[PDB]
DNA sequence: CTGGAGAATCCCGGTGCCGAGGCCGCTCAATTGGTCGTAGACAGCTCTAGCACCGCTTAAACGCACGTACGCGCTGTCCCCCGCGTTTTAACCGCCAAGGGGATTACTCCCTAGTCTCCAGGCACGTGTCAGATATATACATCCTGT
DNA sequence: ACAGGATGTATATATCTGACACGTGCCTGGAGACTAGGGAGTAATCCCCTTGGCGGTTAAAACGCGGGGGACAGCGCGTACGTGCGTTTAAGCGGTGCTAGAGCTGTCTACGACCAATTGAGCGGCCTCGGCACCGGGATTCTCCAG
């Protein structure tokens, strides 16, 4: 467990089914799971990437929660509950 | 005689249950290592706040929830109850 | 030696700090000058909206016989008000959840 | 923070009800965010009309721009009443 | 023998022809009077700039163009080619 | 005289031509009235906000800039009038 | 008597006016202070983007055998450049029309 | 005051034998002013989030990296960086 | 379709722990009390252009006749994802230990705002011409009737 | 589907004008140069919490074996909107005259920023107990089998 791995399954399939239930989804296609990994992956890359842009500007080696919050704000998805 | 529920029963029960509750559903360490793994492209051996990963889970699950609600609006709007990838794609287009 | 100080909020019969909010306005890079009635007026509006949300959250807390407010009630309160939901349609509240909302065709 | 002030308002609305720290932080984020929105819209209102001062007029108009219906109306009622009260004192 | 053409052909010619051009497609005076009429609820006998009304026509027609494109994405998405009010309602819901 | 029922002045053929410019190929008959209502409410919102600027602006005539700023207010910035 | 002046744009090999952009920055309520490399950097970026869109626009005007640029070519330039289109996805250009975009199923 | 003739100078760099219209020039001025305000606003948030009270070319550079997608941002950093460097030796 | 059986979850009852809530030093920020400079309200006036009004045409709206091309439901096909138990991992939980680095403070540099003068690119405002408005005729393009 | 005919539309070609392009008088805003203040870097530190290790359990991921329940196409019904055309209008074009009011200019007052000194509410840390967690057991509730 040193460098990149098969952690794309880390958001697991039953976890996707649970989150979909919390989202109100009643039936889930088999293609939806792969679609969720890809679309969610891309989205997170965008937002977290922007957070990293803040952090690399911030002259830090540790990503703080504020970078994630401001990153969410950057896309008009402002976050309440972390400062 | 198995004690097995019909399709949709457990689904709807967990809908009402997990929508009634508010606790996080993704495992700490794998998701955090996935975050660091995707984050590898900027700095090797990154140190991340635990609460930052908590916020990442919050934004991720909430974002997926809202996005799939819109997907559901499309599927029901398109006379379905089983969501398809192109509904997510349409949602991304309208959102941008 | 000098005359006693009272909060400008209390002079307006308010709880929110006119001074601190006013300072955030001054240091907030918005304009060269901020009118004297502005922080009083703003503090009154925010305290009013705050009273609305807290009042609804209090009610929601009573609906489960609990005296300690948790984020879930704030979620219910925000999404159950049309004008606040219109004010807060793109915002995410940590640990809040979602209002129970299942489309009619999905319910049996 | 503004924590204890939200607690003060809470004691005005529900004297026997308490509140968690995490929810209090959320409310602090709400106050700061909406505050920044209102001040920003007031800032562009000053710019558009070539004004360099944000007065009660700009705030009132901005509130009318940002808040829908009765929240705005009663916000003008409570705000205006309050400004009158301070104008007395 | 009439030279009455076929349903959809002239529509396509309007699509290509009017999407090839850019001029406004609504009469100035009725639109202007509509602006003043709805505007009545603030001041009676309102005076308006002509070019402002023209800008209102610009914004209005462009907004309709984009909204109906999204509507069309929903209709084709929902396997239709005839737009329905529900599509517009879905568009307004997702747009906020 | 005072103006009345000018919502019908935005004619159905004009709406057809716009929808063709919008890329619509077939239009339901209910769409025309739905469009008058939806577009009407929309314009009430944007123009109403412009009037809020104007009444703040101490003017009796709505300038184009008010319309531009109103469009910006809803995140629909307009190029070509100031 | 004083020294030979020279525009900051030319010293940076730029066309766009450093001074007015810097003035808008100062009187635009953004910060207490704005760094010296900021206006030069900004004018270079905007000039570069301007060159990109005017280049695409000029080519588009050439495509219709005309020498005067009209808004239509600006609309074409914006919606045809993916990154600029992303930058301007929710902006409305008056008298611009749209790109010819008919959904494949709608064509015969 | 407008950027009209400056856009014309850029036009003379890209297409010397091509003309323009006042309305399209107004559109371009609106584009420059709008994108300008976006960049300055984001730079303001950048200074604020880390409680910096100074917007420098570093904040502008990061801001440009935030706003412009991909290769346009890379060439923006290229042209701006080269430009600023070229100026700082004069 | 109507009626009986069972478990999950809620609920009903009873128990102990710790974080929320209330206290307690200890700041440091909001308040008051002045003063200074100025943004902006006000009054009258200018004079554009918006209102108001005149007059004739047909672009455009409205309505009708006709046909066509569009949505939608049902049944079947099939097909695939949900449900649950079982195994297995390894996250989780509970536990052990160092020091990286976040955050701080202390020094000191040096970068950026502010001014005054000067002047030159640009501002407003006129002028001529070729872009563009207009005219006329046609193969090509597009449709469509016809075979 | 294949072929020929008819007409719109851009195109070939040909003509006429005005708004764009360029010039001028003038200005006011940007550059030079200079100062003064103060934001942020650098160095080195403390100690939190991150990293990195041990160790057992079962939550949870993965998988398999049904099988229930959902997407989708055909197809036939069956409608209603588009296209064009003829009539009619008032917008359009263009033409007329005045003054409402945007905008300016000159007033002068009023308001918000600013600084310093004090201080009391609030900040940070520190307990305390009943909210909450935990547990155990039945009603309700919801599902599902049964006749």
Author numbering:
A (entry chain B): 19 to 101
B (entry chain A), E (entry chain E): 37 to 132
C (entry chain G), G (entry chain C): 10 to 117
D (entry chain H): 33 to 121
F (entry chain F): 20 to 101
H (entry chain D): 32 to 121
Question: What's written in the study?
Answer:
The nucleosome structure is stabilized by electrostatic interactions between the phosphate backbone of the DNA and positively charged residues on histones. Nucleosomes are highly dynamic and can move along the DNA in an uncatalyzed or chromatin remodeling enzyme-driven way. In this work, we solved cryo-electron microscopy (EM) structures with differently organized histone octamers and DNA. Our structures show conformational changes in the histone octamer that are required for DNA translocation and thermally driven nucleosome sliding.
The second class (Class 2—distorted nucleosome) was reconstructed to 4.0 Å and shows a nucleosome with differently organized DNA. A closer examination revealed that most of the DNA and many histone core α-helices are in a different conformation in Class 2 than in the X-ray structures. Although in the X-ray structure the distance from the dyad to the opposite side of the histone octamer is 66 Å, this distance shrinks in Class 2 to 61 Å. Our structures show that H3 α1 moves 4.5 Å in the Class 2 map compared with the X-ray structure. H3 α1 coordinates the DNA at SHL 1.5 and the movement of H3 α1 also pushes the DNA more than 4.5 Å toward SHL 2.5. H4 α1 coordinates the DNA at SHL 1.5 together with H3 α1 and moves in the same direction as H3 α1. Although H3 α1, H4 α1, and the DNA at SHL 2 move by > 4 Å, the contacts between histones and DNA stay preserved in the Class 2 structure. As DNA slides away in the Class 2 structure, the interaction of the H4 N-terminal tail with the DNA at SHL 2.5 is lost. At SHL 2.5, however, the DNA is distorted and does not resemble a B-DNA helix anymore, suggesting that the DNA might have adopted another conformation at this location. In the structure of the distorted nucleosome (Class 2), α-helices of the histone octamer rearranged but remained attached to the same DNA SHL. This class reveals intrinsic nucleosome plasticity and shows how the octamer can be distorted without breaking contacts with the DNA.
